[PDB]
Design an enzyme around this catalytic site. Structure first.
Site, mmCIF file in Angstrom:
data_model
loop_
_atom_site.group_PDB
_atom_site.id
_atom_site.type_symbol
_atom_site.label_atom_id
_atom_site.label_comp_id
_atom_site.label_asym_id
_atom_site.label_seq_id
_atom_site.Cartn_x
_atom_site.Cartn_y
_atom_site.Cartn_z
ATOM 1 N N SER A 245 0.874 -1.092 -0.091
ATOM 2 C CA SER A 245 -0.017 -0.361 0.119
ATOM 3 C C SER A 245 0.729 1.207 0.009
ATOM 4 O O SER A 245 1.629 1.335 -0.942
ATOM 5 C CB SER A 245 -1.060 0.054 1.143
ATOM 6 O OG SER A 245 -2.083 0.727 1.050
ATOM 7 N N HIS B 52 -6.849 -6.212 -0.307
ATOM 8 C CA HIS B 52 -5.450 -5.553 -0.812
ATOM 9 C C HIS B 52 -4.402 -5.872 0.405
ATOM 10 O O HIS B 52 -3.204 -5.430 0.131
ATOM 11 C CB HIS B 52 -6.229 -3.997 0.010
ATOM 12 C CG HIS B 52 -5.254 -3.011 -0.156
ATOM 13 N ND1 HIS B 52 -4.658 -2.458 -1.116
ATOM 14 C CD2 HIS B 52 -4.743 -1.959 0.731
ATOM 15 C CE1 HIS B 52 -3.865 -1.353 -1.109
ATOM 16 N NE2 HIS B 52 -3.799 -1.234 0.230
#
Ligand SMILES: [Ca+2]
Ligand SMILES: [Ca+2]
Lengths: 256, 257
Positions: free
Chosen positions: B78, B233
């Site tokens: 991320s 994610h």
């Protein structure tokens, strides 16, 4: 049956420890709340700002104060967390329907609150790579510990997945049992801590709290029920959550 | 046998990598996860910092300790992609490969914040997350505390609930220090641009859309791309084995160079 469990970690540990159990309890309809005590988990305070059980326990007390009406909670305390739930029951006996000790220090009423901890210290001294240190808090010098990798892997998380060992390794913080302060406190009483249903849960493969020691605790102040969990290490909530959840279900049912 | 350094995103910490470390070690590698400043159980508080240089300090300090002739694989998830990009720019000699893991991957033509500004334009569904700000130096800094629903529906969207619950009791207030980021000089060919870049992404990412991740890949082509079926994610939580398998290949690719 819908109960409100409050889950209390030991020193050096934090709320994160209960991550496997919370969802299990919630799936069964219960409310499960795990909090960080002072200088524990991600609590922003540092250990040196603190030297007493009253301040260490503040967030547990504050939480119990905020429980409404004549509603009651089940307090679940692991390892050194048993002391926390014992203090809370002594201070708010009306708000507690049951105490669950989870390979935990379980005090009594006939001796000092530190009695059960003095016995543990007398009987277990194999701390291996754990680092001891101390600091000043007023007139007390306080002894603190940072848990070692081997202590975590061989003695505490001794039968848990390695990834949980690795998790603890990046989360455990410096902790203390504030023994001088503990010794300082008045005995628990029949009408407080002693008035509540006490359940003793223990793990057959606990490598830090010996079978001998946990049995000693049970005999020193008999609980209302005892559970032995096959193959569990000191961290039942990590090594055998399903069994632990099953057991806690029965406790909730039995609470009313 | 390689040395992986695993870098979390803002609000997160070293803890996030707990499933992966043992996998990489079983395969013979060194895997080191650290907390950045005011992250994880780092004792600092967010208000004490306002720049990427200070936020990254522990990563830089770690890489400085690696000796000449030796190289590390930097894995950034991320917002952690920015961290590994800065590190590569500052110590290109010490990095054999950059692995982006559903991560912001900067370029050299644009400001270092470019790729983050694009994300902010294209994703705004923050739900119960709480925004706040504070003053640091001569900048006011915007910070976020990730909400329960954001964690469960957007980030950990396909991970075991116990991991959602874990994150809930660990995530801390974070910031992307955007003013500072936009302040920095563009990355360069000879630094960040000189290193093997591997883009790994998750098919079921509910915060970094497929469209956005593809946009990042085409905006500055990497040397390889991996899509992980069914991953959210947080690949390192929802599909560690696939992630470990991929990282093995990257390590193999890095050897003999
Ligand atoms: Ca323990
Ligand atoms: Ca994230």
């Amino acid at each position: 049956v819908s109960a409100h469990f409050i889950l209390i970690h030991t020193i050096c540990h934090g709320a994160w420890l209960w991550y496997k159990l919370i969802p299990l309890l919630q799936s069964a309809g219960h409310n499960a709340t795990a909090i960080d005590l002072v200088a524990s988990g991600i609590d922003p305070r540092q250990l040196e700002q603190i030297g007493t059980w009253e301040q260490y326990s503040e967030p547990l007390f504050t939480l119990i104060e905020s429980i409404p009406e004549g509603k009651k909670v089940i307090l679940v305390g692991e390892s050194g967390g048993g002391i926390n739930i014992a203090l809370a029951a002594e201070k708010y006996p009306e708000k507690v329907s049951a105490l669950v000790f989870h390979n935990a220090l379980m005090p009594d009423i006939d001796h000092s609150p530190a009695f059960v901890y003095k016995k543990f210290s007398e009987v277990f001294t194999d701390w291996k790579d754990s680092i001891f240190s101390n600091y000043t808090y007023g007139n007390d010098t306080v002894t603190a510990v940072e848990l070692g990798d081997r202590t975590l892997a061989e003695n505490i998380f001794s039968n848990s997945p390695i990834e949980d060992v690795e998790l603890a390794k990046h989360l455990v913080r410096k902790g203390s049992f504030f023994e001088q302060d503990l010794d300082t406190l008045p005995n628990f009483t029949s009408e407080g801590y002693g008035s509540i249903r006490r359940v003793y849960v223990y793990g057959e493969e606990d490598q830090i709290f010996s079978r001998d020691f946990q049995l000693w605790q049970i005999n020193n102040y008999k609980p209302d029920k005892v559970y032995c969990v096959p193959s569990a290490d000191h961290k039942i909530q990590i090594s055998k959550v399903n069994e632990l959840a099953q057991i806690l279900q029965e406790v909730a049912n039995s609470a009313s």
